């Protein structure tokens with residue numbers, strides 16, 4: 001599906017709006033992206 | 034989708050298109066009892082296994 005994440009997802013002003021949610025790496029897993 | 038090899042289907046079994054050999058992590062064959070009424074399977078994961 002189509003799409004703010006402005007200016008960047010790292011320092012976005014509304015983290016609840018940007019679909020790229022920040023998570024942590026678990027045991028036996030890799031970086032999701 | 035898949036087709037039936039016993040009788041036959043008007044379509045053709047086409048679910049992959051990779052002409053070369055893709056990278057595979059597991060490829061084995063297992064034989065099951067053909068004269069059986071019900072089959073049971075489990076599929077779960079934990080810690081990437």
Ligand SMILES: *[C@@H]1O[C@H](CO)[C@@H](O[C@@H]2O[C@H](CO)[C@@H](O)[C@H](O)[C@H]2NC(C)=O)[C@H](O)[C@H]1NC(C)=O
Pocket residue numbers: 060061062
């Ligand atoms: C598991 O069994 C299938 C079916 O017998 C094997 O698929 C055959 O592979 C050969 C080449 O190795 C082809 O010539 C046959 O036409 C295939 N059969 C079918 C029905 O597609 C498969 O190779 C087996 N896997 C292993 C690891 O032994």
Ligand SMILES: *[C@@H]1O[C@H](CO)[C@@H](O)[C@H](O)[C@H]1NC(C)=O
Pocket residue numbers: 066067068069070
């Ligand atoms: C398959 O199941 C039937 C009955 O369900 C049984 O008689 C037969 O021995 C089984 N086959 C094998 C190889 O155990």
